[PDB]
Write a protein that binds this ligand. Structure first.
Ligand SMILES: O=C(O)c1cccc(C(=O)O)n1
Ligand SMILES: O=C(O)c1cccc(C(=O)O)n1
Length: 115
């Protein structure tokens, strides 16, 4: 509370580390469904069903232009990509399995980097 603070964690490398983790996700071979925004004009249903589209290139833009106030807001956008994937795709499909793989891949990098 006021004048009562926990020891300060050094957060000065967070931006560069998040950028590094995003790059590792983008080079994963199962990243292809997530690299660019879904085409809202060519994919029936997606615009109406998915209230908040997110993808790796949009995350890169936000990251590089200072639009994440902290670590956690970056993580939320990354998870949003995979939650959207799960909402719109059957588990038993290539894209469905891609999403599962990428989420697990991310959460490991995340844990290994910060926790
Ligand atoms: O690209 C878009 O934003 C889009 C595409 C198809 C329909 C609509 C719409 O009717 O709102 N919007
Ligand atoms: O964007 C739309 O098509 C829209 C607007 C208002 C309500 C609803 C709805 O009830 O789904 N959908």
């Amino acid at each position: 509370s006021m004048s009562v603070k926990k020891p300060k964690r050094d957060d000065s490398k967070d931006l560069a580390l998040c950028s590094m983790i995003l790059t590792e996700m983008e080079t994963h071979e199962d990243a292809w469904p997530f690299l660019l925004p879904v085409n809202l004009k060519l994919v029936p249903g997606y615009k109406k069903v998915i209230k908040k589209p997110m993808d790796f290139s949009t995350i890169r833009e936000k990251l590089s232009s200072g639009q994440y106030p902290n670590l956690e807001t970056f993580a939320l956008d990354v998870r949003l990509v995979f939650d959207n994937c799960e909402t719109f795709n059957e588990d038993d499909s290539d894209i469905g399995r891609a999403g599962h793989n990428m989420r697990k891949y991310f959460e490991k990098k995340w844990t290994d980097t910060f926790k």
